Swiss-Prot record, chain A:
GO terms for biological process: ascospore-type prospore assembly; autophagy; exocytosis; Golgi to plasma membrane transport; membrane addition at site of cytokinesis; protein transport; vesicle fusion. It is found in: Cytoplasmic vesicle, Secretory vesicle membrane; Cell membrane; Cytoplasm. Belongs to the small GTPase superfamily. Rab family. The lineage of its organism: Eukaryota, Fungi, Dikarya, Ascomycota, Saccharomycotina. It comes from Saccharomyces cerevisiae (strain ATCC 204508 / S288c). GO terms for molecular function: GTP binding; GTPase activity. GTP binds at residues 8-15, 56-60, 114-117. This is Ras-related protein SEC4.
From Swiss-Prot, chain B:
It is found in: Cytoplasm. One of its GO terms (molecular function) is Rab GDP-dissociation inhibitor activity. Interacts with the GDP-bound form of Rab GTPase YPT1. Interacts with YPT10. This is Rab GDP-dissociation inhibitor. Disulfide bonds: none annotated. InterPro entries: FAD/NAD-bd_sf, GDP_dissociation_inhibitor, RabGDI. Present with 7280 molecules/cell in log phase SD medium. GO terms for biological process: protein transport; small GTPase-mediated signal transduction; vesicle-mediated transport. Coiled coil: none annotated. Belongs to the Rab GDI family. It comes from the Eukaryota. One of its GO terms (cellular component) is cytosol. Regulates the GDP/GTP exchange reaction of SEC4 by inhibiting the dissociation of GDP from it, and the subsequent binding of GTP to SEC4. Plays an essential role in the yeast secretory pathway. Extracts GDP-bound YPT7 from vacuolar membranes, antagonizing vacuolar membrane fusion.
Length: 175, 441
């Protein structure tokens, strides 16, 4: 079991990425998708069958009113911005600070530039890595609409988390 | 930018409002939920320690002094109003049906202790404790047991189960006589199981006392050793959980957004909308607590003293229990109202390691509240710091048909949430036009 979060400004596509990864669906409808609490999905990591527990913000990020229970015990946190919206990029530094307070610095973060399919792009892929590198976390450029590197987001994060679990096991020197 | 038209505007994120907001959103309505304060919970919020000093002390200590003595604020989540959850209560039945159990974790409360002649005695949890308790002699326990068998065996629609008693016509004292129960036992059953704050129930009909006694017993049965549950991280988790239910189903949430002006419809007086620093929002009706419409609220006459005490050690004569309720019936002190104590501790991530929170509360009946609570303070031993505060209990003047301003009641001085859920069921009907019937999600 792994509690994974998706955080970022409203409109960046957090709920689409989640729905694409689990259900393999995209809804272009301009509405927010409501009705999503969390999804479950089994991932396979080096033989190990790991269940991801993926929690939606339910729109509470919209006025910075996210519930504490959301953050608690999160092992991985996906920070997301919209490559067509510069403000959603600028605010990542702020989200980073916030998440590191509430997750209590034990969570593995990961930066995602969403809507890489759009031609109305205003943040380059290189800009995104500059910030990712600056913060000490990996980078993926995704599109929930076109399924561009969406799986890679979740596998990359799951893999890092298991790396830390596995290297913290006490060694059976005795037997 | 933001929609300005909603099916319902809800003001203040107390538990009552949050439960309403959630249920309305589940129903398909479009809720907007605003709070002037920078955090969830309203009057029943759990707050950090520094905030506890800011709220109730005249000369707050330095960060540096507080932290060496008590630790960092992130370990503290201190209830402003002491409550527990009846195991088979209605708030938990809502939690289950709405799946908000996903956003909140519960521990059982270790036990319930009752006060007598200046000494606290544990309410028996099983047969072994029953047998060894010195509250009742051998034969009193038998009658008591025959009484409790009746509470279970009683079935409304079968007269042959009633043992010759009518819950409408007979008084509780008359029921107690029937079974042969002496006055100490009456007090026990009345204040410790039925959870009355005075002895008036004795002359009143049995029905309500029966129901409450059946609830106690049913709550002890469900998971075992006691009738109470308590949320990890404090009571503040409860409203936050329902806020999320609401958000999941369509609700919008704004904190730290004071209501600059309420807007009423031209001539009619009814509710139109509100005016915030984030623009202006409209709805055909509003659900709000009393601090948003003081003029549409009247006092109920009662004022409640609430004393929050930090201890360094378990409560005396409690077998080092992690959580605890102490009931001090009024007869034992010459009062009109019981005193209550609720204890929780680091086991519930409400305070830093090693500490205990003891929240004493009662209905004031003198001009010196601090003295009224003294018997309770003696039960606690060495207290590290007391946070005192008085709150007046308001209710709505009208039911909101006139104005579509549907107000909630202030949180009362009872030890659990049964009455709060009574307020929710009520306010729901007033607003919806329909009883609250519970769906599983
Ligand atoms: N073109 C494009 N649009 C997207 C993508 N992901 C989301 N959207 C759209 O952007 C809007 C925001 O969706 P949502 O997942 O609710 O954003 P959220 O606030 O971050 O949860 C919706 O109208 C989506 O259809 C994407 O990868 N490409
Ligand atoms: Mg969303």
């Amino acid at each position: 079991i792994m509690k994974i979060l998706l955080i970022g400004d409203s409109g960046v596509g957090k709920s689409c990425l989640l729905v694409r990864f689990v259900e393999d669906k995209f809804n272009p409808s301009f509405i927010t998708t409501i009705g999503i609490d969390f999804k479950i999905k089994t991932v396979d990591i080096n033989g190990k069958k790991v269940k991801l527990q993926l929690w939606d913000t339910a729109g509470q990020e919209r006025f910075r009113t996210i519930t504490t229970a959301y953050y608690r015990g999160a092992m991985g946190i996906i920070l997301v911005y919209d490559v067509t919206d510069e403000r959603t990029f600028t605010n990542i530094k702020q989200w980073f600070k916030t998440v590191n307070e509430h997750a209590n610095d034990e969570a593995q973060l990961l930066l995602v530039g969403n809507k890489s399919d759009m031609e109305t792009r205003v943040v380059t892929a290189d800009q995104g890595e500059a910030l990712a590198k600056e913060l000490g976390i990996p980078f993926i450029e995704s599109s929930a609409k076109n399924d561009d590197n969406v799986n890679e987001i979740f596998f990359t994060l799951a893999k890092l988390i298991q790396e830390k679990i596995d290297s913290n096991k006490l060694v059976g020197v005795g037997n | 930018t933001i929609d300005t038209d909603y099916d319902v505007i809800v003001l203040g994120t107390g538990i009552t409002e949050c439960i309403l907001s959630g249920l309305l959103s589940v129903d398909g309505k479009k809720v907007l939920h605003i709070d002037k304060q920078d955090h969830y919970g309203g009057e029943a919020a759990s707050v950090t320690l520094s905030q506890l000093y800011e709220k109730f002390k005249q000369n707050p200590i330095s960060k540096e002094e507080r932290e060496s003595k008590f630790g960092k604020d992130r370990d503290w989540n201190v209830d402003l109003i002491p409550k527990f959850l009846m195991a088979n209560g209605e708030l938990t039945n809502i939690l289950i049906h709405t799946d908000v159990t996903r956003y909140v974790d519960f521990k059982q409360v270790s036990g319930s202790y009752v006060f007598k002649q200046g000494k606290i005695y544990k309410v028996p949890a099983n047969e072994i404790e029953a047998i060894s308790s010195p509250l009742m002699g051998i034969f009193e326990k038998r009658r008591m047991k025959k009484f409790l068998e009746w509470i279970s065996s009683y079935k409304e629609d079968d007269l042959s189960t009633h043992q010759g008693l009518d819950l409408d016509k007979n008084t509780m004292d008359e029921v107690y006589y029937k079974f042969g129960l002496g006055n100490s036992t009456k007090e026990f059953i009345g204040h410790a199981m039925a959870l009355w704050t005075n002895d008036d129930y004795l002359q009143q009909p049995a029905r309500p006392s029966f129901e409450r006694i059946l609830l106690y017993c049913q709550s002890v049965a469900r998971y075992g050793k006691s009738p109470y549950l308590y949320p990890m991280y404090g009571l503040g988790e409860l409203p936050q959980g329902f806020a999320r239910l609401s958000a999941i189903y369509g609700g919008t949430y704004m904190l730290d957004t004071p209501i600059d002006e309420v807007l009423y419809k031209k001539d009619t007086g009814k509710f139109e909308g509100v005016k915030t620093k984030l623009g202006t929002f409209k709805a055909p009706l509003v659900i709000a607590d009393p601090t948003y419409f003081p003029e549409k609220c009247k006092s109920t006459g009662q004022r409640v003293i609430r004393a929050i005490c930090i201890l360094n050690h378990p409560v005396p004569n409690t077998s080092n229990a992690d959580s605890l309720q102490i009931i001090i019936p009024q007869s034992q002190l010459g009062r009109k109202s019981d005193i209550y104590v609720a204890i929780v501790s680091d086991a519930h991530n409400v305070c830093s390691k090693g500490h205990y929170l003891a929240i004493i509360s009662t209905i004031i009946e003198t001009d010196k509240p601090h003295i009224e609570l003294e018997p309770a303070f003696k039960l606690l031993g060495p207290i590290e710091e007391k946070f005192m505060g008085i709150a007046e209990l308001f209710e709505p003047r009208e039911d909101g048909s006139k104005d579509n301003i549907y107000l909630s009641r202030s949180y009362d001085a009872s030890s659990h949430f049964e009455s709060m859920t009574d307020d929710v069921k009520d306010i729901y009907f007033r607003v919806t036009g329909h009883p609250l019937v519970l769906k599983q999600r």
